[PDB]
Design a protein around this ligand. Sequence first.
Ligand code: CLA
Ligand code: CLA
Ligand code: CLA
Ligand SMILES: CC(/C=C/C=C(C)/C=C/[C@@]12O[C@]1(C)C[C@@H](O)CC2(C)C)=C\C=C\C=C(C)\C=C\C=C(C)\C=C\[C@@]12O[C@]1(C)C[C@@H](O)CC2(C)C
Ligand SMILES: CCCCCCCCCCCCO[C@H]1O[C@H](CO)[C@@H](O[C@H]2O[C@H](CO)[C@@H](O)[C@H](O)[C@H]2O)[C@H](O)[C@H]1O
Ligand SMILES: CCCCCCCCCCCCO[C@H]1O[C@H](CO)[C@@H](O[C@H]2O[C@H](CO)[C@@H](O)[C@H](O)[C@H]2O)[C@H](O)[C@H]1O
Lengths: 221, 312, 41, 226, 85, 213
Amino acid sequence: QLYVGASQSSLAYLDGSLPGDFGFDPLGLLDPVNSGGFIEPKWLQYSEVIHARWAMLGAAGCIAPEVLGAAGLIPDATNIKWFESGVIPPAGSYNGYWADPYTIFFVEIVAMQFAELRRLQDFRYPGSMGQQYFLGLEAIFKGSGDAAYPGGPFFNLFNLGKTEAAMKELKLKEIKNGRLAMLAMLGYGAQAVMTGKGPFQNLVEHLADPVNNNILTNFAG
Amino acid sequence: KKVKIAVDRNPVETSFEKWAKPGHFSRTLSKGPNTTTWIWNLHADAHDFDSHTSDLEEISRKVFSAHFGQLGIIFIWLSGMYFHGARFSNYEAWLSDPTHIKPSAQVVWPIVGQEILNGDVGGGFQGIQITSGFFQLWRASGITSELQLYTTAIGGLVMAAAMFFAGWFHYHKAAPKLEWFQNVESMLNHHLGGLLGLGSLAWAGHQIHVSLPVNKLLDAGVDPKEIPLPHDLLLNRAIMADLYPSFAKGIAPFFTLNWSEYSDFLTFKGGLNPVTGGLWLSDTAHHHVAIAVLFLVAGHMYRTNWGIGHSM
Amino acid sequence: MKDFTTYLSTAPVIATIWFTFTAGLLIEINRYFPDPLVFSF
Amino acid sequence: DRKLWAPGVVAPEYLKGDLAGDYGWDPLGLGADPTALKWYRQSELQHARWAMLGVAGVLVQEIVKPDVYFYEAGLPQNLPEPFTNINMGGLLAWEFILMHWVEVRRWQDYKNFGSVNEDPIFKGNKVPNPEMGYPGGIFDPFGFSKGNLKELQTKEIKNGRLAMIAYMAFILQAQATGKGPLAALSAHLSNPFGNNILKNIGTCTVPHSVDVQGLTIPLTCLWPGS
Amino acid sequence: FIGSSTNLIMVASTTATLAAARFGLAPTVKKNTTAGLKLVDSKNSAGVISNDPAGFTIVDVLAMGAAGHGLGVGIVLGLKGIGAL
Amino acid sequence: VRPVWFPGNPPPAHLDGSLAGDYGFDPLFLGQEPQTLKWYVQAELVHGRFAMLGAAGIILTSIGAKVGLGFPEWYDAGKVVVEKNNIDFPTLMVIQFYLMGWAETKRWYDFKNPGSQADGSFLGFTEEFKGLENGYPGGRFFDPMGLSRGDAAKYQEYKQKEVKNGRLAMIACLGFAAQYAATGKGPLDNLADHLADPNHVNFATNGVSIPIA
Ligand code: CLA
Ligand code: CLA
Ligand code: CLA
Ligand SMILES: CC(/C=C/C=C(C)/C=C/[C@@]12O[C@]1(C)C[C@@H](O)CC2(C)C)=C\C=C\C=C(C)\C=C\C=C(C)\C=C\[C@@]12O[C@]1(C)C[C@@H](O)CC2(C)C
Ligand SMILES: CCCCCCCCCCCCO[C@H]1O[C@H](CO)[C@@H](O[C@H]2O[C@H](CO)[C@@H](O)[C@H](O)[C@H]2O)[C@H](O)[C@H]1O
Ligand SMILES: CCCCCCCCCCCCO[C@H]1O[C@H](CO)[C@@H](O[C@H]2O[C@H](CO)[C@@H](O)[C@H](O)[C@H]2O)[C@H](O)[C@H]1O
């Protein structure tokens, strides 16, 4: 096979399991023969899942102050664009937070060493994280054999996807709204470098003029 | 995929055990000295990788990670010259009067009377008058401040440790197989397109967006602390349209093939810039653009994984 | 790291440590004693 | 144990319905240690019973008088007629020592369940303590225990858990708008679109400090914004 | 600009290179050229699962899209340089 | 099985759990020799022993200051006491080397020969300077409460409680210098500034700690 651009060579190992699979592999990065380092078939499927569900938080995160501002639910002072929040102080920074964005960045540093490195030592050592004392909260962190899908009693709160056959759908649907959303973050970023506006403003301006307001009539002729 | 990534996981244990035994690479040297010709043959046969082993794969892994060692030493060497360009120089003073102030970037320590080597190079400064011409690179790069030289010196130390990591990784942890190196079609498609082609595309983009508006303001005559910083030359298109009035047309004349409308800052002047004696920078900008389009085209010559392309 | 201390105890590494010792000693003496042409008191 | 907090959720192995109010919950693994589950049970009972006094304090102190505001009811200018401008240092001296007795006796009922049942002064009537957290005896002057005890032990928590959330509501419906709970009930039921959760989250009606007889207090709302 | 003199050239140069290699008038992934000029079958170096009947992959689209832009940009700026638009 | 500095990663082979404060933290394998690690166990203690004395010394003289007392700050206590009391400065430091260089070479020949210093070579004191183990002498003088004997199960607990307070005392005395070079004032002035406004009066808002101010 599906999703043209595939090949016979990237179809031997790439069978139909390992969900999100559609056979699209022109270059053949994931390949279980002779692999090593970060082009391992396990690290690449894992990093795709992680790149998916960070992007879809950002894809619903870059669009949300602008949509809720047009709907009037948030005040106009927080109706800023996603690059004008302090992520890029060259592009503009909101000055009304509860701290300097270097205070909040160090709170981000601490909270993401404790989040990401616990997240990494279950990739390396899969049975870990439910071994040493971590506030009694280590009973969550047993995970499973697969690193991208831990499924503890917190990360699978509502125990959704009970059977195996129902689980392959939701694992597919996560990547399907992930590979859309990774493209959406690329279609937020590159579309804001060129235009200089928000994503929802570019949605409104394309519904207003479909022809005279698109990629073509935006090179500032 | 005949052209594919192929490495071997952990060929060599990262261990200091073989540093204890000099001459470990060769049979003739590992039994210790009995003669001072041992320690000369140690340094002579050290990088003779073809003579250590017979395996061409083991030779190839040794010359691949040694090249990261040479690149890692060049990144130390470059980062020295930007650092000695930053903290011990007169590059601040040189840009204001680059006719009388002699370029100097080495300063010696006053101990045995060797401080007399700190000449009167001008610019309120004493030091060895250098001749390697880095200050002429840096005005061509539009550096204009010793902050920029310090940040790219720290960027040189970071890049050198990345290169030392890479030779360590691609030898000890994950070293390539032999048929990885024997894809000379894939190497030339990547080196003509990516290294030479995209390199001169990227440097032209540095010359369009940074060096041209900085050196136009230096030739028109502006003190270097008054020139806009080059990130302001990116975020504000209205500044660029003041110097070259065709940035107001955006990147529309490129895609509409109205390339003659870019004639302000991609030129074919030739000769020399009479204000500064050097080549015209807009001339060198259209140079590295047309160099890049040439090599990216030539970088799609050889056949790797689809039937198009030549086979050597 | 016992093998690493053997490397630190090879011939050129002790040579380049002891020569930084002996030059670095004579450099500090020739700083705090400027220009000793003749043995004073 | 059954009818859990969500339909398709498997209850954890340590929550087989022994304790009251057991709903197969804890999606944070905190009761996985058996010795920690007892202490979290004791601290749940404490957070339930103080909140049930807290809810029955706040919505009764404004029925008896809707004048003194419960957020600033601790200031000595707002204390009643025999206590107006009392020394708060003296009143804290009573409360600290009267509570360092009670709590440590309760704490030693946790640590040694059984060697704290007697009145230590008067070696007389004991307190028959059936299970930890439920002393009884003189804490049951009405004899409302000794029936279906499990039924009332669930009723104590379910009323208690709602009172915990209602008391954190009683605070956040007071820092956002500066108004009492039945008073914010009147503010909703007058105009239920301009006095909702919208346009009051993001404004803190509390100052940086209110001086008490020569002492400042940090006085922080539960979210930033003013 | 749509339908101008240059936009007609770029469509009639790209689609000419697409119609060449699809209809056997230019090499593809499936077929190369010999040491002479004859158009002969290839190894394809991966094997393709192109659903199209002619074996015309997206790699065939990108190549003759780059050549169609490659011919056409030289035609447009060659005609601006000689003066004929 | 034991708690390690970094969960997941196993402790190194040279570092089974018998030392006090052992958490497997030797990423550079500096204790890979079992006899230099006997020296660094001595070294972690006497660095922590002086830092526990130090960090209590900075804090207790800064508690007295800013209340209203006539105390100096710890960076200015050096000048103010060789000036108030007319104490000549080289003759103060030399006696510090005499008394402690006495007390240090006794340690330096406890490490070389643990049975030594207990031959009556001193004024008659024999088993007071016997030494119980590495970094823990004990005996009559160094443990006058007698806490290193009697119950040894609680003594292993006190060994860990010494190292735990000893680690973060070294971090404190690395932070007192860091709070002084960055800000330029006393330690409990930096605490009370952080308690005045916890936002914006942290390390991020100096311009000395992050250069991206
Ligand atoms: C001479 C240069 C060179 C060459 C030929 C290789 C070759 C290889 N490396 Mg290696 N590597 C290098 C330098 C090099 N490396 C350096 C300098 C480092 C240190 C950072 C590494 C670290 C490294 C790791 C950790 C791994 C490899 C891997 C690989 C293999 C596959 C690479 C691949 O498909 O990634 C394709 C490339 C990408 C997907 C891009 C990665 C993201 C980069 C950093 C951004 C693009 C950088 C760009 C060139 C310049 C900046 C652009 C920017 C300004 C926009 C292959 C054997 C992998 C492997 O198979 O193990 C052996 C692997 O796991 N390498
Ligand atoms: C377009 C991709 C690309 C690029 C940019 C390069 C770039 C380079 N290769 Mg190369 N290579 C490639 C693909 C690529 N290769 C492929 C596909 C193969 C397999 C057929 C090889 C096999 C190969 C060998 C066998 C050797 C090189 C070497 C080199 C270096 C030439 C040294 C020089 O002139 O300094 C130019 C220096 C720079 C431009 C500095 C920037 C360096 C960048 C950051 C690293 C190169 C990008 C890297 C390939 C992308 C992967 C990122 C990594 C994190 C995974 C240069 C870094 C030689 C070398 O130096 O070995 C280390 C060498 O011996 N290459
Ligand atoms: C069919 C339509 C058409 C038309 C009318 C033109 C018309 C023109 N083209 Mg053009 N072009 C076309 C199609 C067309 N082109 C196509 C399809 C391509 C893509 C391949 C190009 C690519 C192209 C380039 C790259 C250039 C032109 C240039 C020119 C202009 C002047 C040519 C000249 O005087 O060079 C006469 C030059 C010489 C006789 C000397 C050439 C020698 C070179 C410089 C170095 C030696 C190379 C090599 C060693 C020689 C032997 C190698 C051999 C085996 C290939 C002229 C207006 C030039 C231009 O715009 O200048 C303003 C220019 O640089 N064209
Ligand atoms: C005790 C309490 C309040 C007691 C209040 C009192 C006495 C108030 C008295 C006063 O007001 C009056 C009467 C009058 C005022 O003038 C004076 C004061 C003095 C102000 C509230 C606790 C309230 C306690 C609350 C709300 C606790 C909520 C905790 C929750 C929801 C956590 C759930 C979880 O942690 C678990 C349980 C398991 C995990 O697996 C899952 C998650 C979700 C993590
Ligand atoms: C590596 C990926 C390859 C592509 C290179 C991308 C490099 C990243 C550059 C980001 C810097 C911001 O670049 C871009 O910012 C502004 C937003 O459009 C543009 O600024 C322009 O747009 C604004 C709103 O449209 C207006 O103020 C003006 O039109 C003008 O200032 C700049 O002309 C451009 O430089
Ligand atoms: C994956 C795809 C990545 C992007 C592929 C490259 C983009 C497409 C190639 C450019 C196609 C033609 O490009 C061009 O056509 C448009 C006509 O509608 C022009 O649009 C504009 O042209 C003139 C401005 O210069 C104006 O007089 C026109 O009113 C306006 O339509 C754009 O300036 C330009 O983009």
